[PDB]
Design a protein around this ligand. Sequence first.
Ligand SMILES: [Mg+2]
Ligand SMILES: [Mn+2]
Length: 541
Amino acid sequence: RGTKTLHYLSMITVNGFPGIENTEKRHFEEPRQPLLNLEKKKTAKNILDEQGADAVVDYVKNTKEVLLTDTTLRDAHQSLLATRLRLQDMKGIAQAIDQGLPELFSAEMWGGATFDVAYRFLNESPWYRLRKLRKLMPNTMFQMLFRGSNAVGYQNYPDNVIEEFIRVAAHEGIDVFRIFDSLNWLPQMEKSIQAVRDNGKIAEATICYTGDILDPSRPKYNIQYYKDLAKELEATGAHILAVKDMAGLLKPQAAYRLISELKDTVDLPIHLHTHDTSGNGIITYSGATQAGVDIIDVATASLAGGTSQPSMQSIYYALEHGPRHASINVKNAEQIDHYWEDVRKYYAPFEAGITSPQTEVYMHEMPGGQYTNLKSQAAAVGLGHRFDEIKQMYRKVNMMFGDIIKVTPSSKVVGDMALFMIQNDLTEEDVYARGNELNFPESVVSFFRGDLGQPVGGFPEKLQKIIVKDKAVITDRPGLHAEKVDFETVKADLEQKIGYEPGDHEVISYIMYPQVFLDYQKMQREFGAVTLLDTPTFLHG
Ligand SMILES: [Mg+2]
Ligand SMILES: [Mn+2]
């Protein structure tokens, strides 16, 4: 253990940290520990543990105030710090979050990019992070972002694999599963919702908001589409209806109209998740609060704004004297935000830069992760000076594909198409004419084969035959055609590859990420548990 520790320390000291500029270690002060005025309240986690998920739904329904879900541990640092927030910085404040903020509905700490990024770059197990945070926060519900068909991975998986992931995640401490589909397709979400219900946890059926319901020029995603989707999601038996605004597209008037119209439609509580990219996140949450939204997704102030969530303290002060107040202790929240600012000072190499509110997201509708990835891709191929034209081409490609819902991985399809069109100097007419000779990117080909599912209204028929030439096109769930996985065989093979008997979580991690888990195990054998190091020492040695 010690030998591995000085091995990692010497490696980082001499060769630097991979992916960041080699820089001498700055001296940091100790992060400020909060002074909390503690109150003992019965949280939603106590209700879930004692009386179940339906009692949690009843408690949310009977709460006149708007509940808050803290996205600091997942989405705030996914948007701002490239998901690089380490478990050490979280566990410095996890107990303070659990005790000083018992009014929180849940804390989003898992799913999304965290599962892959922790293994690949932070060299720490996300299961280990979940276990440590669960021990430190016994009275906080743990929210996770769950893709309905692929769980946290990106490959095609059978239904039993997704069910096993749900069972193991619920056993290890995930309480709320925010289940979403990239194309808002119900069959991808139905089985995951049913498995979350069978494990006794809270299933959040999620609608991804795209376009503008108040714009009649785009009637594909109008209020009737969202009402029908909410009715279908209510039919699945999900406890809470969720509305994901991945790019901050929901305008406050549209927010009020959408939340009200969903409110007379279904009786589920409504959870709204938005980003502050346009700078309108606070007023969007306020307009949803007047319409009667139940839970909204907020982040701590030092990790809020920009591509991240709206601030929890600011949304408290925005609704302080209105008809509905935010359910939070704002003094404890500010005391915690002091620590979060101090530890955000550690992650200077991963900062995006100077950030201003951008209303161009109303035009290209790119999520912040897709925005950063496409900017880096354009910089790599020598087209970084044409990023405005790349964004225009992104909007045009989204319209060409039939106005699809753009989130991971469907936003990557549009980004790859836009980059390929900019690279080869192609217009819409050029693709419709010379697309037979063209070799489209594999993500676009996989999307038009049906590997991502079926989009709303189907594919454009001519563009589909242009993009996929002789490859087979499926019209049903790709998980039905997934190659069968036997957990005993995978467990035995993993016991051969790594030098010990794996747990259920390790087998399920090997199934989601085969090469990434093996690389993590090799780095664990070489460098040990580097998660115990502090972040300046972890990055600079
Ligand atoms: Mg309520
Ligand atoms: Mn988000």
